[PDB]
Design an enzyme around this catalytic site. Structure first.
Site, mmCIF file in Angstrom:
data_model
loop_
_atom_site.group_PDB
_atom_site.id
_atom_site.type_symbol
_atom_site.label_atom_id
_atom_site.label_comp_id
_atom_site.label_asym_id
_atom_site.label_seq_id
_atom_site.Cartn_x
_atom_site.Cartn_y
_atom_site.Cartn_z
ATOM 1 N N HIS A 171 52.123 45.633 26.647
ATOM 2 C CA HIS A 171 52.697 47.024 27.014
ATOM 3 C C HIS A 171 53.760 46.730 28.318
ATOM 4 O O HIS A 171 54.612 48.447 28.361
ATOM 5 C CB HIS A 171 51.124 47.090 28.715
ATOM 6 C CG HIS A 171 51.624 48.597 29.182
ATOM 7 N ND1 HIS A 171 52.114 49.721 29.322
ATOM 8 C CD2 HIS A 171 50.974 48.749 30.425
ATOM 9 C CE1 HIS A 171 52.566 50.318 29.782
ATOM 10 N NE2 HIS A 171 51.533 49.601 31.385
ATOM 11 N N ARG A 218 66.585 57.761 30.582
ATOM 12 C CA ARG A 218 67.207 56.677 30.695
ATOM 13 C C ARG A 218 68.342 55.884 30.332
ATOM 14 O O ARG A 218 68.541 55.321 30.974
ATOM 15 C CB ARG A 218 65.601 55.905 31.582
ATOM 16 C CG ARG A 218 64.630 56.527 31.854
ATOM 17 C CD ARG A 218 62.986 56.699 31.836
ATOM 18 N NE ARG A 218 62.612 56.529 30.385
ATOM 19 C CZ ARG A 218 61.740 55.808 30.266
ATOM 20 N NH1 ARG A 218 60.901 55.634 30.804
ATOM 21 N NH2 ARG A 218 61.304 55.947 28.916
#
Lengths: 438, 94, 338, 438
Positions: free
Chosen positions: A271, A326
């Site tokens: 994650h 981003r």
């Protein structure tokens, strides 16, 4: 001029009534089916979360309350002399849905820094944790240790109306946010340096307080953290850290226990360490090519990587059909601040040939880089070379979107998340009955 | 007198008792005889208590200081003392 | 009065509390101290035991290697002869005059040197050391750490250190276990040098009660180091495995790693005569205790100086103290712990 | 000879893995449920979103551990000598393997757990310096997280171990964790409520025995109660917050330490693990109003006045279970056979005789029957554990068995990361408008 709490107290009743009408009129509408393969496959594709802060636009990237990365770079207030958006300003946007003013952001920063002093027992335990206890573990330990200060837990024990839960949740969240830069830098100084910290500048913003306490006064580093902490603040509610915090929070645990649990999910290797995995791959590539970043050399490496069955980390998404804004925002920061940095030149040379190579291979749906393919090199430039600390920085940022949703959930009285489970044997019996009654 | 002290103790490196520490604040000869009496009557706890007090008078002190305090002649050559000093350093934490 | 007019039995009890102070007072206490550890050794490993028969010459060579530092103390006991089949154990030079050091050499596992240091997965090293059977049940007073020694050419190649896997277990007995430090220990290495990294402590490898009533005092501890870096960092000698030791350096100041200057040769860390003793002792134990063949060839393993160590301490409040480090005795000497 | 828990599980898990693969391959596209808009806004109630093997709730017979009811495990599981109570270690063997262990296998598992019970120095130091006003559940999660430095799975993952070896290190971490939980909970109890002085672990005593002894009691009847308490609270499906949180965090490959700590934070939620304290507080308020008059008319008077005032009778009323919780009856039999004249149990017993009838005549409760939480506080109050704020810690010491059993099972079968889909309310409106129009 209104504060964040006053403006939110005026907006959330509107959102609450809108949701109440929406469920009353369309509540019986089916939005998806649950297949057996989904419950055995991590509930992929199942709509099981209402996250207001951010939604992924398949062609424009992540949208914070409908605003893209380009939108928030244009509209959000900035620090004096900086072209980078402030994470406090994005937090105002995530919670209210409106862009704050310059004076409102500065007052929010002053409020956060006024809540930044760590209790003595938190400073004590951090100073006594051994350095071989992972920084992410020290992070959630310190956050959990602040539960003794929880205004929500004390108010719930005394007896408060359900319609007042959000108020104490709001104060706990801001008390918690103000201390996250101090906690993170305390861990950084203790584990990787000499344990000496500076003092919080009451007029500095969130990211600047983090950089100064880490031990740097470079304004370009401060601007990097402002961009980093902003663009990692939130990314839907399906990811493990966001889902965990919402799940723990739905049982009316305070923001301290909800964030600490979310951080433990972020600590998971599947994650919260994508940009470290990119950094390891870049270093292995840099050793093989001996710092030859030519088009022919890089393409040969990428083809050998793909033909051998391995992937190019940071490149390839299942939804977004273009390059992550981003990523482009971090590429621009490097172009304008250190275009000659050797490690950035390697990242740039990959950006110029990897989409073309991945396309010819034809086994990658969207051969474009995401935010994790570029964040590591920027951190390496200013001395943050300890990869294990990167997940702590991710947590300092993601806590904004996590706490924004937690305040919203308490304001609208969100219900406790309680799905149903079965054993494999009972799933067999359930499937047989469904298929017999075709 | 030693028999009286032993009966007192019966009436009243594991840690030493503070009452036994006051009980063993007597002179060195009396302390020697108390250890002797405990060894003779098989009073092992009183024996160990007297030994620990003597050990504290020795612990951490140089060989020369122990020889003067406990009246012992040095029969070592200077190089033999240096070699023993290195051996004892091997037994230290470093 | 004097301390010498006390009975011998009282002196032996005093030696249980202050042995190192008394053994430096006069020849009487030194010889009595040596006799005390003669009784400790022989009550543990009787004179007729097989261990003395197979380790005699190698053990004597190890003790002899200490003569530049302790010969004048060893020669206080004079009625000794060179080791031989017809020389009794109680008359053997480098043993009968060295019971204090012999006893400690047998009570703790010696170092393991990587004899191939100067030559998906690739075996970097496979060797042995002798391990007391009750190492686990004595871990409070005497924990058994596992330390690894690396040469690191720069801080960037240090990131491969957690990918060198250390696999330990009893030779031809029981499952193997892996000892490892934190995965981010490399991030505390910031320059070239020789590094000693603590991999934790020796885990529980068996239930000691299965060795109750069998007369077994030592087991062969097999160590295997595996290169799983998926790189050429070890093939290019940018990361060189020097060996292992089980020494509890600086018990009072817990540490994660320490650095010494890379110019030092491998003999500054490892005593070849000690490693040869531990290796052949463990090999002889494996041949006596198991019918199965040892899966690797039998290797042949063949002046302490002040080397300053710079520690990375485990506790954040522990600051550096260079003056203390300069004054400490050498750390490449034997560690007498019992 | 007698196989160990790990050896037996190593033989069992590949069979379960092949069974799951063929089941999803043959029936994976079978739709098992719908997702209505009201469900995603109602905490996914009724949505099958978890595969939990250890336990399934039977609407008629209560909770079933691998098909065994409470009466079954009280008959089938091994017990300590001289005791008639099931051992929690024995149920852990059942949850993980699906088989009943032998009496020697349980005794060997207990010895292995107690051999791993030594707390590291930094955990003892950390707990001793935490303030007394920090809630024991917060100190519990903190101590568990602080053990991450010992995690064999995190170290093995950093070494790049194969995915097929995950379960082995997950298993060892779980046993290291289970072995230290009684010491952690007792250390917290001694520090917060006593003099902080604690004994040493008996290597031959069982799990619940070491917990009671370290708490400060040698009463074997107290030990028998703890054997029963820790057994019946070990597992209860995977939909509850604590079990769901640990699975969610564990699905990101976080160690059992971070997975359990996150699950404990969910259990600390007032809407999840505080039912025991709620019943006890309501019982003491009743005891003071009636002044030891537990006549059926006096108790029925208090129940009707409470139900008419809008307040509920805590512990009574379940949405699924159609009879009295067998966990309640097991605790009721314990009080009848050990202290039937205990004043507080006489109050509980009279409510059991009256409350089902009172709630039935009020008509606003479906199944007016008590659950386990309506009977646990009085039994703990009898043996000196009267500090109710510590009760959830005992719940966590028990629930960790079921949490860690499922976690070991998840890693052995390679369970995927739980990642559902999220939307904002705005996008949910658009998704509904497109569905209804078509």
């Amino acid at each position: 001029e209104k504060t964040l709490k006053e403006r939110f107290s005026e907006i959330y009743p509107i959102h609450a009534q809108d949701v109440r009408q929406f469920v009353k009129e369309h509540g019986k509408t089916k939005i998806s089916d649950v297949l057996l393969e989904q419950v055995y496959g991590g509930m992929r594709g199942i709509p099981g979360s209402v996250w207001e802060g951010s939604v992924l636009d398949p062609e424009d990237g992540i949208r914070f309350r409908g605003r893209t990365i380009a939108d928030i770079q244009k509209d959000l207030p900035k620090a004096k002399g900086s072209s980078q958006p402030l994470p406090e300003a994005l937090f105002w946007l995530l919670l209210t849905g409106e862009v704050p003013t310059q004076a409102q952001v500065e007052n929010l920063s002053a409020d956060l820094m006024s809540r930044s002093e760590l209790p003595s027992h938190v400073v004590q335990l951090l100073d006594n944790l051994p350095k071989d206890l992972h920084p992410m573990a020290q992070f959630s330990i310190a956050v959990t240790a602040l539960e003794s200060e929880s205004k929500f837990a004390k108010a719930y024990a005394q007896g408060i109306s359900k319609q007042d839960y959000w108020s104490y949740t709001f104060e706990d969240s801001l008390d918690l946010l103000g201390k996250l830069p101090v906690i993170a830098a305390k861990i950084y100084r203790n584990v990787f340096k000499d344990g000496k910290m500076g003092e919080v500048d009451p007029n500095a913003d969130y990211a600047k307080n983090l950089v100064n306490l880490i031990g740097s006064k470079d304004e370009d580093f401060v601007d990097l953290m402002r961009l980093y902490l902003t663009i990692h603040s939130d990314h839907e509610g399906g990811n493990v850290s966001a889902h965990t915090s919402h799940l723990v929070g739905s049982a009316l645990s305070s923001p301290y226990l909800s964030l600490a649990s979310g951080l433990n999910g972020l600590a998971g290797p599947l994650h919260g360490r994508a940009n470290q995995e990119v950094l390891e791959w870049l270093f292995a590539l840099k050793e093989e090519v001996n710092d030859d970043y030519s088009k022919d050399t890089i393409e040969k490496y990428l083809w050998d990587t793909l033909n051998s069955g391995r992937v190019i980390p940071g490149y390839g998404h299942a939804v977004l059909r273009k390059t992550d804004p981003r990523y482009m925002a971090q590429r621009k920061f490097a172009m304008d601040h250190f275009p000659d940095y050797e490690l950035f030149k390697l990242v740039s040379s990959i950006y110029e040939v990897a989409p073309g190579v991945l396309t010819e291979h034809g086994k990658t749906k969207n051969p474009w880089p995401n935010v994790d393919a570029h964040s590591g090199v920027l951190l390496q430039y200013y001395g943050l070379k300890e990869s294990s600390f990167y997940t702590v920085l991710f947590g300092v940022s993601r806590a904004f979107g996590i706490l924004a949703q937690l305040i919203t959930d308490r304001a609208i009285g969100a219900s406790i998340e309680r799905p149903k489970s079965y054993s494999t044997e009972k799933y067999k019996e359930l499937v047989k009955n469904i298929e017999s009654k075709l | 007198s030693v028999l009286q002290k032993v009966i007192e103790w019966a009436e009243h490196s594991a840690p030493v008792d503070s009452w036994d520490r006051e009980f063993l604040k007597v002179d060195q000869e009396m302390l020697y005889e108390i250890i002797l009496a405990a060894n003779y009557l098989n009073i092992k706890p009183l024996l160990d208590a007297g030994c620990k007090v003597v050990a504290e008078m020795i612990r951490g002190r140089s060989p020369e200081e122990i020889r003067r305090t406990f009246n012992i002649v040095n029969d070592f050559t200077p190089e033999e003392e240096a070699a023993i000093r290195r051996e004892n350093e091997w037994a230290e934490d470093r | 009065s004097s301390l010498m007019d006390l009975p011998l039995e009282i002196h032996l009890s005093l030696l249980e509390y202050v042995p190192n102070e008394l053994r430096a007072v006069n020849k009487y206490f030194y010889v009595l101290h040596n006799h005390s550890y003669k009784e400790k050794s022989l009550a543990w490993i009787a004179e007729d035991n097989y261990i003395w028969a197979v380790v005699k010459h190698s053990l004597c060579l190890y003790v002899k290697s200490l003569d530049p530092l302790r010969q004048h103390a060893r020669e206080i006991i004079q009625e000794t002869k060179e080791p031989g089949f017809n020389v009794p154990l109680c008359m053997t030079k480098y043993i009968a005059d060295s019971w204090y050091i012999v006893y400690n050499a047998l009570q703790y596992p010696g170092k393991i040197i990587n004899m191939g240091w100067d030559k998906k997965e690739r075996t970097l090293m496979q060797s042995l050391t002798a391990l007391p059977v009750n190492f686990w049940s004595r871990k409070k007073d005497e924990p058994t750490p596992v330390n690894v020694w690396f040469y690191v050419k720069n801080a960037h190649v240090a990131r491969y250190i957690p990918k060198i896997i250390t696999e330990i277990g009893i030779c031809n007995y029981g499952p193997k276990q892996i000892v490892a430090s934190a995965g981010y220990i490399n991030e505390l290495i910031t320059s070239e040098g020789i590094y000693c990294v603590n991999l934790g402590h020796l885990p529980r490898l068996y239930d000691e009660q299965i060795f109750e009533g069998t007369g077994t005092t030592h087991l062969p501890l097999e160590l295997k180091a595996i290169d799983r870096t998926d790189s050429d960092v070890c093939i290019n000698s940018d990361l060189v495995l020097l060996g292992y030791d089980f020494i509890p350096y600086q018990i009072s100041k817990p540490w994660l790693l320490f650095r010494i200057e890379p110019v030092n040769s491998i003999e500054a860390i490892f005593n070849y005569s000690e490693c040869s003793f531990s290796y052949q002792f463990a090999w002889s134990l494996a041949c006596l205790q198991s019918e199965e063949k040892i899966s690797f060839p039998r290797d042949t393993i063949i002046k302490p100086s002040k080397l300053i160590r710079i520690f990375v301490y485990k506790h954040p409040e522990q600051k550096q103290d260079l003056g203390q480090e300069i004054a400490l005795p050498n750390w490449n000497t034997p560690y007498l712990r019992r």
